[PDB]
């Protein structure tokens, strides 16, 4: 079409031509209200208006509620806690209602007023026309052939060698800052320096170190020594390795040491007093026949499957249970895993009492504690 | 591997699985149910449940294989 006859095309004809250029034919398009001046059109217009107006009023409610509602947290069982509890639900209600009503109004406008159409477009997919494929292939092949890189093997080999070497060097210098040896001896021990995974807070450090089983009071002095008579039969305790040289939480270094022993992943120990009427049922592990002090046994509180705290002690079944994957170990059979995905027994900590009578650890764990790895056993 | 009489819309999409895949699948599922009896558990009710389900699977596979081998099932 020329400028003169483009100047004399109606908008519908121009839309048809534009669609035809792009490959689109609108085979149906009709106004939504062919019959003028009906009450139904007024009703639909007012419905869309009401939805948009509800969106507007809910946005206004959002503004007002956000600015003026009492939002600050209120303590338990006090006045103003109901308004605080309603604070966030009111934000959600107003915001969601406003934007949802606006969306509903838009959908209704599309369905009721925008003319229904059925357009058809040609995909023009699959292979390109042979002219385009041949020209692009010729351009690429001409680049590669005029470059002459093919007939110069020394340059190509040198380029490959250099790019590969630079890439290897850059990748190594990139990843290498993250690579840490897990077996570098960094942990002191009464037998030299040892890897982290071989040691915990129960590992003695100067060959005769008194390590107390300390309960967590959960408070200044969060750990305290404890005596065997402080556990009633069928009772369970979570103890931690606490030494005299760790302090009582007053000085800042004391708090640092107490934090570092409370956060030790392999630190917590479950201490259980078997009822004597059941001590005949105890089966002892080879090499750990003398790790209990009478009725008190001590096991690791770290599951052997994936390291979660297996911290559910069922006294009437003497079953240690891990909530992460439902493993069950028998506390009467050296914490042997009787159920679940765990296949290794929990480590048993040797315990005794000192001169004053306070429960202490009688050595170290006779094996690695947490979940297994390649280098175990 | 099917006819229009068995799967009406056979020309329209993937509609046949070779019966070998199902037979070996049943045998392997039975073997897995059986091998799950080795592990850590005191009780033996679960062992009988595994044995019963494996028996049902092996019986189904055996019947299907026998009927295809004799001609009734195709």
């Amino acid at each position: 079409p020329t400028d003169a006859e483009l100047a004399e095309m109606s908008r519908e004809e121009l839309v048809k031509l534009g669609g035809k250029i792009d490959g689109v034919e609108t085979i149906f398009k009709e106004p939504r209200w062919p019959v003028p001046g009906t009450k139904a059109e007024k009703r639909t217009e007012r419905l869309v208006a009401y939805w948009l107006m509800l969106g507007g009023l809910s946005g206004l409610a959002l503004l007002l509620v956000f600015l003026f509602w009492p939002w600050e947290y209120q303590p338990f069982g006090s006045e103003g806690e109901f308004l605080y509890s309603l604070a966030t639900p009111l934000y959600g209600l107003t915001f969601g209602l406003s934007i949802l009503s606006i969306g509903i109004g838009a959908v209704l406008f599309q369905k009721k007023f925008i003319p229904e159409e059925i357009s058809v477009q040609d995909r023009h997919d699959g292979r390109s026309p042979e002219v385009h494929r041949k020209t692009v292939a010729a351009n690429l092949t001409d680049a590669l052939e005029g470059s002459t890189l093919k007939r110069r093997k020394v340059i190509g080999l040198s380029l490959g060698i250099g790019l590969g070497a630079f890439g290897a060097g850059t990748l190594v210098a990139f990843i290498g800052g993250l690579i840490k040896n897990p077996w570098k001896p960094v942990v002191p021990t009464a037998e030299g320096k040892k890897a982290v995974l071989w040691t915990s807070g129960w590992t003695p450090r100067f060959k005769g170190e008194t390590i107390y089983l300390a309960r967590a009071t959960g408070r200044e002095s969060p750990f305290v020594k404890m005596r065997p008579e402080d556990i009633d039969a069928g009772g369970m305790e979570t103890v931690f390795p606490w030494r005299e040289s760790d302090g009582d939480g007053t000085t800042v270094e004391s708090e640092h040491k107490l934090t570092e022993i409370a956060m030790g992943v392999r630190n917590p120990v479950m201490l259980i007093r078997i009822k004597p009427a059941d001590m005949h049922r105890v089966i002892k592990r080879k090499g750990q026949e003398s790790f209990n002090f009478g009725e008190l046994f001590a096991y690791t509180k770290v599951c052997s499957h994936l390291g979660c705290p297996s911290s559910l002690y069922e006294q009437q079944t003497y079953r240690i249970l891990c909530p992460c994957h439902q493993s069950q170990f028998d506390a009467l059979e050296f914490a042997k895993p009787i159920f679940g995905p765990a296949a290794r027994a929990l480590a048993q900590l040797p315990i005794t009492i000192d001169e004053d009578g306070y429960l202490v650890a009688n050595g170290d764990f006779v094996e690695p504690v947490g979940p297994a790895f390649w280098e175990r056993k | 591997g099917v006819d229009v009489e068995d799967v009406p819309s056979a020309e329209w999409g993937w509609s046949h699985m070779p019966i070998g895949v199902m037979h070996i699948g049943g045998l392997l599922s039975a073997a897995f149910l059986l091998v799950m009896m080795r592990g850590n558990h005191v009780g033996h009710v679960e062992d009988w449940f595994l044995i019963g389900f494996a028996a049902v699977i092996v019986a189904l596979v055996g019947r299907n294989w026998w009927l295809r081998r004799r001609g009734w099932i195709r």
Binding site: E333, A343, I353 | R38
Partner: peptide
């Protein structure tokens, strides 16, 4: 999907073992 193996170092015992001795700690 294969079989299971018991840990080589997780056997039981029959020896009852001696009661632990009272603990004494070296000064350092």
């Amino acid at each position: 999907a294969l079989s299971a193996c018991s840990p080589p170092g997780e056997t039981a015992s029959s020896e009852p073992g001696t009661t632990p001795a009272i603990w004494t700690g070296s000064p350092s």
